[PDB]
Amino acid sequence: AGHMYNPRCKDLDRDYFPSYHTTRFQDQPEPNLAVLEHFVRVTKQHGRELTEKQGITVDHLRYGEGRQLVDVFYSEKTTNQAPLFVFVHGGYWQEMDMSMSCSIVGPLVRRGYRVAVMDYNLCPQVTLEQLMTQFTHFLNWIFDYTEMTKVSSLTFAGHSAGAHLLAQILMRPNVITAQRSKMVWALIFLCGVYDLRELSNLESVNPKNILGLNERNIESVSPMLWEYTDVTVWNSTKIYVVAAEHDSTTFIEQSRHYADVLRKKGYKASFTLFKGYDHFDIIEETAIDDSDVSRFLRNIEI
């Protein structure tokens, strides 16, 4: 009978771990471990190269306590009112940090963007609901920053758990006013997860319920299940829901389903399945200006 986003699923825990679904590293005895080892190593190298090789400047900022940090990258070519690209990393709300999250910066900076790569507190130090509240704080802080600095427009991208976190931007109208909404050129949801009801009961993904989920809050933390309202304030904003071809069926379907919920509600949203990519190299190749994913990002700017 399978599961909620994969009617032929043979192993639910495996369907929630994208590492098992790559076509890379098949010369290794455990390709899932090799993809993650490579991802950490190469993203860290991308982060170092921005200032060691590519002549990019970074401002190291703090927006809150703990891991509430944000690095803002630019160059000597960046204009005072340059648009801001905000990237929200993944890691299942429990791992990854800014050091693994800066692959995307270089080509954007070369095109005249300022890029904010943010970090956040992780579960279990915060519950998922507390992380979501801290992320509303981050959104308020980033819009104050862009208002102070007269930025021409904002684009937000989230990857994996970061795409989940980003989804609240559509439903926090006490912070995101209609004028703030109008400032958003695009929202990019890369390989997200939006319905947390299955994973909440997996010890693999949510060991010991570190995310702090229960039947009282499981809808609040699941963007798939929200009753979206005031959709017209977003009508100028382009929304891109993206999945990787070599992701699990549950991940691909969660993205197809979420794009369909946003389109039905009336958002300017599309679904894209990225051919030949897995859940990890869809971020690794954002460090290469002419890659397929880098060019997709460039084309959103046109």
Curated annotation (Swiss-Prot):
InterPro entries (UniProt xref): AB_hydrolase_3 (IPR013094), AB_hydrolase_fold (IPR029058), GDXG_lipolytic_enzyme (IPR050300), KFase_ver/fungi-typ (IPR027519)
GO molecular function: arylformamidase activity
Keyword Hydrolase attributed: yes
Pathway connected to this protein: Amino-acid degradation; L-tryptophan degradation via kynurenine pathway; L-kynurenine from L-tryptophan: step 2/2
Domain of life where this protein originates: Eukaryota
Signal peptide, first to last residue: none
E.C. code: 3.5.1.9
S-S pairs: none
Annotated catalysed reactions: N-formyl-L-kynurenine + H2O = L-kynurenine + formate + H(+)
Motif range (HGGXW): 89-93
Function recorded in the entry: Catalyzes the hydrolysis of N-formyl-L-kynurenine to L-kynurenine, the second step in the kynurenine pathway of tryptophan degradation. Required for elimination of toxic metabolites.
Family: Belongs to the kynurenine formamidase family.
Free-text note on domains in this protein's UniProt record: The main chain amide nitrogen atoms of the second glycine and its adjacent residue in the HGGXW motif define the oxyanion hole, and stabilize the oxyanion that forms during the nucleophilic attack by the catalytic serine during substrate cleavage.
Assembly and oligomerization: Homodimer.
Protein name stated in the entry: Kynurenine formamidase
Organism: Drosophila melanogaster
Gene responsible for this protein: KFase
